[PDB]
Design an enzyme around this catalytic site. Sequence first.
Site, PDB file in Angstrom:
ATOM      1  N   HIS A  59       0.914  -1.138   0.000  1.00  0.00           N
ATOM      2  CA  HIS A  59       0.000   0.000   0.000  1.00  0.00           C
ATOM      3  C   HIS A  59       0.959   1.194   0.000  1.00  0.00           C
ATOM      4  O   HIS A  59       1.800   1.315   0.890  1.00  0.00           O
ATOM      5  CB  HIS A  59      -0.871  -0.013   1.262  1.00  0.00           C
ATOM      6  CG  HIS A  59      -1.924  -1.077   1.244  1.00  0.00           C
ATOM      7  ND1 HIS A  59      -2.482  -1.599   2.390  1.00  0.00           N
ATOM      8  CD2 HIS A  59      -2.537  -1.703   0.212  1.00  0.00           C
ATOM      9  CE1 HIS A  59      -3.391  -2.501   2.066  1.00  0.00           C
ATOM     10  NE2 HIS A  59      -3.444  -2.582   0.751  1.00  0.00           N
ATOM     11  N   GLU A  62       1.859   3.759   3.184  1.00  0.00           N
ATOM     12  CA  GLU A  62       2.356   3.223   4.461  1.00  0.00           C
ATOM     13  C   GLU A  62       3.882   3.269   4.489  1.00  0.00           C
ATOM     14  O   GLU A  62       4.566   2.254   4.360  1.00  0.00           O
ATOM     15  CB  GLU A  62       1.797   1.808   4.646  1.00  0.00           C
ATOM     16  CG  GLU A  62       0.281   1.868   4.842  1.00  0.00           C
ATOM     17  CD  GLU A  62      -0.405   0.539   4.676  1.00  0.00           C
ATOM     18  OE1 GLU A  62       0.277  -0.498   4.798  1.00  0.00           O
ATOM     19  OE2 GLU A  62      -1.627   0.534   4.433  1.00  0.00           O
ATOM     20  N   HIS A 151       3.145  -3.233   6.950  1.00  0.00           N
ATOM     21  CA  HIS A 151       2.085  -2.274   6.673  1.00  0.00           C
ATOM     22  C   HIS A 151       1.912  -1.258   7.811  1.00  0.00           C
ATOM     23  O   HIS A 151       2.676  -1.258   8.783  1.00  0.00           O
ATOM     24  CB  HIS A 151       0.768  -3.029   6.450  1.00  0.00           C
ATOM     25  CG  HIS A 151       0.798  -3.953   5.272  1.00  0.00           C
ATOM     26  ND1 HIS A 151      -0.048  -3.806   4.190  1.00  0.00           N
ATOM     27  CD2 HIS A 151       1.582  -5.014   4.990  1.00  0.00           C
ATOM     28  CE1 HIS A 151       0.219  -4.735   3.293  1.00  0.00           C
ATOM     29  NE2 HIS A 151       1.206  -5.483   3.750  1.00  0.00           N
ATOM     30  N   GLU A 215       1.058  -4.678  11.054  1.00  0.00           N
ATOM     31  CA  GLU A 215       0.536  -3.312  11.090  1.00  0.00           C
ATOM     32  C   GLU A 215       1.412  -2.482  12.037  1.00  0.00           C
ATOM     33  O   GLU A 215       1.245  -2.526  13.261  1.00  0.00           O
ATOM     34  CB  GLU A 215      -0.902  -3.309  11.599  1.00  0.00           C
ATOM     35  CG  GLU A 215      -1.853  -4.247  10.868  1.00  0.00           C
ATOM     36  CD  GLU A 215      -2.086  -3.865   9.409  1.00  0.00           C
ATOM     37  OE1 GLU A 215      -2.207  -2.661   9.101  1.00  0.00           O
ATOM     38  OE2 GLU A 215      -2.174  -4.780   8.571  1.00  0.00           O
TER      39      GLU A 215
END
EC number: 3.5.1.96
Length: 338
Positions: A59, A62, A151, A215
């Site tokens: 992504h 990020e 991420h 994350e």
Amino acid sequence: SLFRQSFLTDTLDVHIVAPAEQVLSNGVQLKLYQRGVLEVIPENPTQETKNIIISCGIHGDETAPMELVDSIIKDIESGFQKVDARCLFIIAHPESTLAHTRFLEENLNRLFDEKEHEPTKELAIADTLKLLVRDFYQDTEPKTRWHLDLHCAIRGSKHYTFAVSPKTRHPVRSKALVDFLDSAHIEAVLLSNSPSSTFSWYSAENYSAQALTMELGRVARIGENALDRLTAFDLALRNLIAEAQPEHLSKPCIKYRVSRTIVRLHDDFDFMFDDNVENFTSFVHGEVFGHDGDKPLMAKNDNEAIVFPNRHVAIGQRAALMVCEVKTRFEEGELVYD
Ligand SMILES: [Zn+2]
């Protein structure tokens, strides 16, 4: 020496991407296959040498992990970072990092499964990523394989850091992987109960890699991230590529399991909470938090929390995950629950 300025800066500059290799003074080998693809091979490879794929930027917006990867490359090239594991650093989708968006045409991390997909810039990219995985894991023992996909969350959470372990019949939830989570200070790990379409899931399902989607913090521009909050993770990651500091003084990360999966049945679907709803927002038994058509959405147990909510999700797809802490243990080197 191999880069004009740095791995991340060169990757972001369209005017520079021809294959090149380089051998460092300490024996470490660096190979730039193409834009954003850097392999690092140790001076003395052995049968127990780990093969770690470290990807970031699936992504575009990020950036924090991209910065961490960029500093690791810089330290490895200067000899400051000891290299003991074979690694494949990936900055996937630099074009989207430039547009400062999640993606250009479609979410890259939904294109790795066997379903039919329309032609998109991300499809072709995913197609190339599957190739990089294949070439890197070729002729390597499954037990040596690792894939850490980095991420950043798009919403807040009581868990600043957390990870997701893919669902596959292969044993990819090892003792070493869990020890890594704990050493990295990742607050929680969600154990998926259903096959996915992410880059991490692809490695686990097709190559039995000890894989995770991590994350790390929230999205922010490059040079504007809360980097200090990722210090524990970065150190754990440096220790992993250097095969050092194997301690067990840290606490166990919280282990979650999927209570249930929410699927959008009708066009009239929505949640009661705002769009800035935090991941792992808990509910009390019987509390209503949304509705699907006429039938409302309410917590079943008393320990459920919602993760990855998305009301825009097309009909028939999943709109959310309901999770809860789980009683875990290691059975034959695999982390299982109940
Ligand atoms: Zn992401």
